[PDB]
Amino acid sequence: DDWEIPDGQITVGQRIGSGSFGTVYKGKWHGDVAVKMLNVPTPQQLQAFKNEVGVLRKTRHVNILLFMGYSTKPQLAIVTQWCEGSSLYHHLHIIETKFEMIKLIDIARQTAQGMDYLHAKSIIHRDLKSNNIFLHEDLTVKIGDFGLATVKSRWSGSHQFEQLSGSILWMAPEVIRMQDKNPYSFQSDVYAFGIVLYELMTGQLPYSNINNRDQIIAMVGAGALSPDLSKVRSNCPKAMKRLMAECLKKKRDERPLFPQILASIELLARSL
Ligand SMILES: Cc1c(Nc2c(F)ccc(NS(=O)(=O)CCCF)c2Cl)ccc2ncn(C)c(=O)c12
Numbered sequence: 001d002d003w004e005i006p007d008g009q010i011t012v013g014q015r016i017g018s019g020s021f022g023t024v025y026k027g028k029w030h031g032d033v034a035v036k037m038l039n040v041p042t043p044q045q046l047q048a049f050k051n052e053v054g055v056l057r058k059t060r061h062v063n064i065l066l067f068m069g070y071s072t073k074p075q076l077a078i079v080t081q082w083c084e085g086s087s088l089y090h091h092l093h094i095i096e097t098k099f100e101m102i103k104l105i106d107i108a109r110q111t112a113q114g115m116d117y118l119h120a121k122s123i124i125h126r127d128l129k130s131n132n133i134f135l136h137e138d139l140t141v142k143i144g145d146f147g148l149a150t151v152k153s154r155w156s157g158s159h160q161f162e163q164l165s166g167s168i169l170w171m172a173p174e175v176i177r178m179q180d181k182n183p184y185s186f187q188s189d190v191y192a193f194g195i196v197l198y199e200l201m202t203g204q205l206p207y208s209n210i211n212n213r214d215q216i217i218a219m220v221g222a223g224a225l226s227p228d229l230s231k232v233r234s235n236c237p238k239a240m241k242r243l244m245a246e247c248l249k250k251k252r253d254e255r256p257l258f259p260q261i262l263a264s265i266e267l268l269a270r271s272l
Contacts, residue, residue: 001050001053003053003057003069003070004069004070004071004072005029005069005070005071005079007071007073007074009029010027010028010029010033010035010071010079011027011028011029012025012027012035013025013026013027013028014026016034019166020159020162020163020165020166020167021038021148021152021158021159021163022036022037022038022039022077022078023036023037024036024037025037026082027079027082029068029069029079031082032081032082033068033079033080033081033082034079034080034081034082034083035071035077035078035079036077036078036079036080037074037075037076037077038075038076038077038078038148038151039075039076039157039158040074040075041072041076045155046072048150048151049070049076049148049151051150052147052148052149052150052151053067053070053078053147055123055147055149056078056147058121058123059117059118059121059123061113061114061117062140063110063111063113063114063117063140063141063142063143064114064117064118064142064143064144065080065081065083065134065142065143065144065145066080066081066142067079067080067147068080068081078147078148080144081142083134083135083136083142084136084137085134085135085136085137085138086134086135087130087131087132087133087134087135088107088130088131088133088134088135088141088196088199088200089129089130089131089133089199090131091135092130092199092200092203092204093130093199093204093205096203099200101233101235101236101237102269102272104200104201104236105237105240105265105268105269106269107135107141107200108196108197108200108240108265109262109265109266109269110140110141111133111141111143111193111196112193112258112261112262112265113141113262114141114142114143115128115143115189115190115193115258115261116258116259116261116262118143118146118189119186119189119257119258123146124149124184124185124186124188124189125143125145125146125189125192126146126149126153126184126188126189127145127146127149127152127167127192128143128145128146128170128189128192128193128196129145129167129169129170129192129195129196130196130199132144132145133196164217165213168213168216168217168220169195169205169206169207169216170191170192170195170196171188171191171192171220172187172188172191172192172252173220173221173222173223173250174188174252175188175191176217176220176221177221180252185252186257186258187252187253187255187257188252189258190247190255190256190257190258190261191247191248191249191252191255193247193258193261194244194246194247194248194255195227195248197240197243197244197247198227198229198232198244198248201232201233201236201240201241201244202231202232202233203233204231206227206228207225207227209228210225223250226248226250227248229241229244229245232244237268237272239264239267239268239271240265240268243256243261243264243265247261
């Protein structure tokens with residue numbers, strides 16, 4: 001495979017963080033890059049990993065984090081562009097950046113634009129959340145962390161337990177239960193997007209009044225817990241508040257898909 005970066009070319013730099021799936025470093029390879037290093041594979045796992053890289057190779061869009069190559073030594077790794085800036089999670093919940101409503105709407109629009117692109121390519125993200133949406137140069141949304149779905153979800157020792165803890169807030173009721181036919185769908189991505197909209201339009205994570213992540217898992221999975229939409233800022237447009245409730249519908253068939261979502265956001269942006 002021609003997308004393997006030969007060993008010895010990448011220089012690792014700053015450790016950005018160690019998540020439930022891999023550690024990300026800033027790096028140098030023809031300039032700044034990000035390097036996500038996975039676990040410390042059999043021939044079958046190497047072939048499966050290359051198959052997953054095939055999915056990443058399908059994505060070429062300015063709202064999608066740019067895949068640049070992969071490595072197998074010292075460990076399996078994914079190399080992408082380096083985003084100059086912070087994630088949406090960092091802005092909203094850590095440093096509490098005060099975006100104007102017009103810019104919050106634009107961030108929502110750009111996120112929907114990337115999701116629409118993925119879905120058009122038959123890619124279900126499965127892991128959308130504000131800490132893998134990066135605000136590049138404070139201007140351009142880049143969505144990442146949709147790669148290696150089979151590696152993340154199916155391989156032994158991929159820290160699935162930790163992944164659950166880190167993703168529960170964005171996870172649709174049917175993804176929690178995994179009982180319905182095809183629990184991961186375009187519609188479950190829409191629900192996660194609905195939670196990102198909640199974060200943008202309230203400045204808060206959902207369920208901040210519920211201390212217990214187990215109660216959240218059980219309650220959302222039972223269809224008995226939804227974000228408190230009364231916390232949306234006073235200047236959030238009513239059409240945007242309605243859209244957010246549509247994306248968050250507990251019954252997945254009631255959720256709009258991203259062509260409709262994009263048209264709604266674009267209409268209200270161009271209505272100001
Ligand atoms: C955390 C992070 C990443 N993470 C990251 C990565 F390193 C490698 C792959 C994926 N995702 S992927 O699905 O495997 C590929 C998707 C495209 F194909 C992601 Cl999300 C990337 C760039 C970053 N730039 C700036 N900053 C501040 C960051 O924190 C940052």
